[PDB]
C-alpha cells in the first residue's frame, strides 16, 4: 500500500514534468500566446510546489491509517488532481517580473536541497547493492560474482577517466580558464581520496560491506555533476544531454525512494516535501556564476556526505 501510493505520486509527478517539458516546445507557443514556454513552465512548477507543500503540511505527523488523513493518502485521487488543476490555473493569475526572480531563487534553493537528499538516497542505494552482491558472491560460485564486481567497477572507473580526459580536452586551456582546471583538480583529488578511504582496514572493520563499487559510482556521479556545472556556464568562450541525464537520474532516484494502523512505514509529510523539492529541481534543470557555485557546492557536500557515511560510525 505504501509503495503503491508512493509510486502513484511519483507517476503523477513525472506526468506533470513531461507536461511542463512539452509546453516548452515551439509548437505550443502560439496556443499559449492566446492567453513563453519558460513562463508556462514556471507557472506549472509553481503550482507543483504549492500543492505538494500543502499536502505535505496536511500529512504532518501521520500516526495511524485509521486517521482519515491516511485514508486520503491512499485515495481521493480525483480531489488531488482537481486541486492540482485549480492551483495551476491560479498560477498564471499572479503577475510576473520580480516574482519570477523570487521563484527563481526559491527554485535554486529547492534544487540544492533535492540534490542533497538525492545523493543521500544514492549512497544508500550503492551500499545496499554492494552488500547484496557481496553476500551472493560469498554464498554461491565466488569466481563468477567476483569477476562481475571487478568488471563493473573497472568499467565505471574507465568511464570516469575518459570523461575527465574529455573535460581536459574541451573545458580547459593553458592560456586561461584556470577556474575550470581548479574545479577538475579538486574534484579529482577528493574523489581519489574517497576511493582510497574505502580501503582503510579500520573502516572495513567498522563497515564490513564497504567496497570499491559504490566508490566508483559516487566518483562517476560527481564527474557528471562537474560536466553539468560548466555545461551551464553562459560564457561559451569558457563553455542538453546533461540535462536529460539529470532527469534520468531523477527518475531512478525517485523510483528507488518510492521503493499502517499502528504506525506509518515512512514519513508521508517528508515524502511530499521531497516530492516538492523534486519539482523545484525539475524547474531549475529545465533552465550565470551563482548556478556554477550551486553545482560545485553540491559536489562538495556530496563528497562530504560520502566521507561522513564512511567515517562517523567509527566515531
Amino acid at each position: 500500500n505504501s509503495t503503491v501510493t508512493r509510486l502513484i505520486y511519483a507517476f503523477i509527478l513525472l506526468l506533470s514534468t513531461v507536461v511542463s517539458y512539452i509546453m516548452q516546445r515551439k509548437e505550443m507557443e502560439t496556443y499559449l500566446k492566446k492567453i513563453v514556454g519558460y513562463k508556462a513552465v514556471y507557472r506549472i512548477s509553481f503550482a507543483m510546489a504549492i500543492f505538494f507543500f500543502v499536502f505535505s503540511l496536511l500529512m504532518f505527523k501521520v500516526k495511524t491509517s485509521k486517521d482519515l488523513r491516511a485514508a486520503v493518502h491512499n485515495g481521493f485521487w480525483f480531489f488531488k488532481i482537481a486541486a492540482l488543476i485549480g492551483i495551476m490555473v491560479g498560477s498564471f493569475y499572479i503577475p510576473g517580473g520580480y516574482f519570477s526572480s523570487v521563484w527563481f531563487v526559491v527554485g535554486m534553493i529547492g534544487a540544492a536541497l533535492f540534490i542533497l537528499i538525492q545523493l543521500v538516497l544514492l549512497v544508500d542505494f550503492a551500499h545496499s547493492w554492494n552488500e547484496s552482491w557481496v553476500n551472493r558472491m560469498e554464498e554461491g560460485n565466488p569466481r563468477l560474482w567476483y569477476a562481475a564486481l571487478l568488471s563493473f567497477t573497472s568499467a565505471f572507473y574507465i568511464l570516469s577517466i575518459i570523461c575527465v580526459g574529455l573535460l581536459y580536452t574541451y573545458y580547459t586551456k593553458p592560456d586561461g580558464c584556470t577556474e575550470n582546471k581548479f574545479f577538475i583538480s579538486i574534484n579529482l583529488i577528493l574523489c581519489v581520496v574517497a576511493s582510497i578511504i574505502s580501503i582503510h582496514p579500520k573502516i572495513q572493520e567498522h563497515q564490513p560491506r564497504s567496497g570499491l563499487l559504490q566508490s566508483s559510482l559516487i566518483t562517476l556521479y560527481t564527474m557528471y555533476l562537474t560536466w553539468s556545472a560548466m555545461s551551464n556556464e553562459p560564457d561559451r568562450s569558457c563553455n542538453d544531454s546533461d540535462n536529460f541525464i539529470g532527469l534520468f537520474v531523477f527518475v531512478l532516484c525517485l523510483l528507488y525512494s518510492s521503493i499502517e494502523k499502528e504506525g506509518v512505514q515512512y514519513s508521508y509529510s517528508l515524502f511530499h516535501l521531497m516530492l516538492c523539492l523534486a519539482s523545484l529541481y525539475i524547474m531549475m534543470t529545465l533552465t550565470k556564476w551563482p548556478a556554477v557555485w550551486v553545482k560545485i557546492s553540491s559536489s562538495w557536500v556530496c563528497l562530504l556526505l560520502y566521507v561522513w557515511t564512511l567515517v562517523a560510525p567509527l566515531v
Partner: peptide, 16 residues
C-alpha cells in the same frame, strides 16, 4: 572464520 581485507570488503568466501 578467516575474514580478510579484500577490495570488495570484509568477507571470508575466498578462504572459507
Amino acid at each position: 572464520f578467516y575474514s580478510r581485507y579484500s577490495w570488495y570488503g570484509y568477507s571470508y568466501g575466498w578462504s572459507r
